[PDB]
Amino acid sequence: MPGTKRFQHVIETPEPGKWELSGYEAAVPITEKSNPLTQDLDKADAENIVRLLGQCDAEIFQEEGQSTYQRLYSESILTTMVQVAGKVQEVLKEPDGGLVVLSGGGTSGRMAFLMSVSFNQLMKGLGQKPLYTYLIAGGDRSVVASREGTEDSALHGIEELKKVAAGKKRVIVIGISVGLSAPFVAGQMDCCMNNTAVFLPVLVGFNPVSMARNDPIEDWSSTFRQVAERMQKMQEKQKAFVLNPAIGPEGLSGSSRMKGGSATKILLETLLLAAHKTVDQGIAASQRCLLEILRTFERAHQVTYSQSPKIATLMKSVSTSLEKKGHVYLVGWQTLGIIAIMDGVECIHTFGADFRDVRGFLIFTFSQEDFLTSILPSLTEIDTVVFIFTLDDNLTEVQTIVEQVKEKTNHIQALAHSTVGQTLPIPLKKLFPSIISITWPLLFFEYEGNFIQKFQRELSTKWVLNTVSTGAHVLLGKILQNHMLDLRISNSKLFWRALAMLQRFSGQSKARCIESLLRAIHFPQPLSDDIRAAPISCHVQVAHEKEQVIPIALLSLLFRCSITEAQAHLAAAPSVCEAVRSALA
Ligand SMILES: CC#C[C@H]1CN(S(=O)(=O)c2ccc(N)nc2)CCN1c1ccc(S(=O)(=O)NC)cc1
Ligand SMILES: O=P(O)(O)OC[C@@H](O)[C@@H](O)[C@H](O)[C@@H](O)CO
């Protein structure tokens, strides 16, 4: 029947009460799951929100229970990290015609960029040629833009890969996809397996391979799952690798920019740093050198979240400014500036928020005076401006900008990273009365830009900004339990996530949910057979431009009414949130 090809794979909605016993819950990929810690996140206050995400983030470092999924600390995973470190060594010994690509869509792609830079720096400070590069769904521009639609083509991924891999002789391709989902990566990994003389694919993500994505990709014949299963078979002969620890669900269901991006750095920085810092010692990478690093990353979580009360406060202020109608500026230096940009941009697609709502700034790349003359003018009594820097940064450039911002603003707060016993110039740096001083112990570092200190700091900022950005929006009522219902459908994964949210919150069949969804998307056109049979990309292209697609679709269902009737209802309610929530009641 029309549509059967496209929707056959979708699991039926269970009868009320049998969500567990239908086996439905057990087949939800971990990366899409509702985290039980966050069932009532939409009710939590700022302090709880910080607590509940701190807990969710902790799950990264939690160990394997005694019938269950491998985790970051499990022996199978650390052994895989060692073996991969090893293959990175091979290429490090033979830099001529060698290359190491880190690749991903969206936040996986963003993380890839950071790491390729860091490790390229590292080989510079040692006077070696840079061997790292990145690849992001939609080219370089995607690093710092909301561009969710660019991940759906396997040919694109392969193309980008062919460009960069030039006339190289030995290529390591680290395909990053948190959900083991992005068609962009899938095609890269498959291409690698079809030329193993040159390519070595390493897939990174955080689902078991039995939960890897399995619906058809429009421009490619195999699924992510088939690709990953075959890489796993090659791992026996050491010609492919799959590195996939479970880290437990996101605190915002399927918001893989959070734990997933974090785990990506923890996992890949750890392994690459080990491989470098152990080549020049002429010693194999071992579980012991990896562990040192992982434990440091784990202290970093503890260090970071011990500043929780302040983190809650900055959340309450970021939220306040967005409840009124102000903006939120994230101003930071080096690498920590970028991360700030990355957070701001992600808020657009993640919460449907305008790019001014939470914006990032590096010193998007607007210099000291340029910021003072351009942006400073537009500031306002209700806004919030966050400063993010180390005490190694150039604090004369910092104080200047805060001096000025204080006048036109007042809601400032800051994120200051330091070694123990560095002191904050100006004891009347108050200015910031109640800073977020994150003060780092003294580690022993032989590489020359203290790369472990950088990684700690990046990660810690990512945790803070993410928790803030996400928390501020939850407080506003935009989140339904631990799901973002009212998302914009801009790729296929999001289209499937909409359909899952329709099933979950309505309890109605998949045929009904699909029908309501496609009607909401294509309104005012009716459901023809063509539309029913259309590739998922046709729906995406149309829904991408509309507003409230998913809430309209859900209303149609709850009221058993038409799209015309549910649009009218929505427009007659005070808000999307009250409309949906009170139809649920
Ligand atoms: C319909 C459907 C579905 C699946 C898979 N889709 S998928 O096909 O894009 C996908 C993504 C990643 C992956 N590893 N496998 C499939 C994502 C959303 N999915 C999903 C399924 C269930 C839920 S939920 O159970 O309502 N939240 C607990 C949330 C999301
Ligand atoms: O790394 P994945 O699972 O292939 O997901 C890649 C991207 O879709 C994902 O990072 C997304 O852009 C983020 O907005 C999710 O919060």
mmCIF file of C-alpha atoms and ligand atoms in Angstrom, residues 105-108 148 151 176-182 254-257 349-350 491 493, ligand 2:
data_model
loop_
_atom_site.group_PDB
_atom_site.id
_atom_site.type_symbol
_atom_site.label_atom_id
_atom_site.label_comp_id
_atom_site.label_asym_id
_atom_site.label_seq_id
_atom_site.Cartn_x
_atom_site.Cartn_y
_atom_site.Cartn_z
ATOM 1 C CA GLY A 105 27.160 16.112 11.390
ATOM 2 C CA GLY A 106 26.008 18.940 13.652
ATOM 3 C CA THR A 107 27.503 18.787 17.130
ATOM 4 C CA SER A 108 29.565 15.755 16.251
ATOM 5 C CA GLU A 148 20.396 20.462 10.582
ATOM 6 C CA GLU A 151 23.379 15.320 7.431
ATOM 7 C CA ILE A 176 31.404 10.352 14.725
ATOM 8 C CA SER A 177 27.652 9.860 15.088
ATOM 9 C CA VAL A 178 26.242 9.805 18.520
ATOM 10 C CA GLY A 179 23.145 7.895 17.565
ATOM 11 C CA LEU A 180 24.945 5.812 14.995
ATOM 12 C CA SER A 181 22.502 7.605 12.734
ATOM 13 C CA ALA A 182 23.897 10.250 10.317
ATOM 14 C CA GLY A 254 17.571 12.900 21.952
ATOM 15 C CA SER A 255 19.436 16.115 22.567
ATOM 16 C CA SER A 256 22.695 14.507 21.668
ATOM 17 C CA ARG A 257 24.546 17.899 21.669
ATOM 18 C CA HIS A 349 17.222 24.371 16.255
ATOM 19 C CA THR A 350 17.106 22.878 19.730
ATOM 20 C CA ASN A 491 16.063 16.256 8.722
ATOM 21 C CA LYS A 493 15.850 11.801 12.207
HETATM 22 O O1 LIG B 2 25.939 12.688 16.078
HETATM 23 P P1 LIG B 2 24.504 12.317 15.569
HETATM 24 O O2 LIG B 2 23.722 11.418 16.427
HETATM 25 O O3 LIG B 2 24.775 11.666 14.099
HETATM 26 O O4 LIG B 2 23.679 13.653 15.545
HETATM 27 C C1 LIG B 2 24.249 14.673 14.774
HETATM 28 C C2 LIG B 2 23.405 15.904 14.862
HETATM 29 O O5 LIG B 2 22.081 15.656 14.289
HETATM 30 C C3 LIG B 2 23.232 16.294 16.312
HETATM 31 O O6 LIG B 2 24.502 16.633 16.884
HETATM 32 C C4 LIG B 2 22.309 17.482 16.345
HETATM 33 O O7 LIG B 2 22.737 18.452 15.376
HETATM 34 C C5 LIG B 2 22.252 18.118 17.673
HETATM 35 O O8 LIG B 2 21.384 19.202 17.439
HETATM 36 C C6 LIG B 2 21.514 17.236 18.648
HETATM 37 O O9 LIG B 2 21.309 18.016 19.836
#
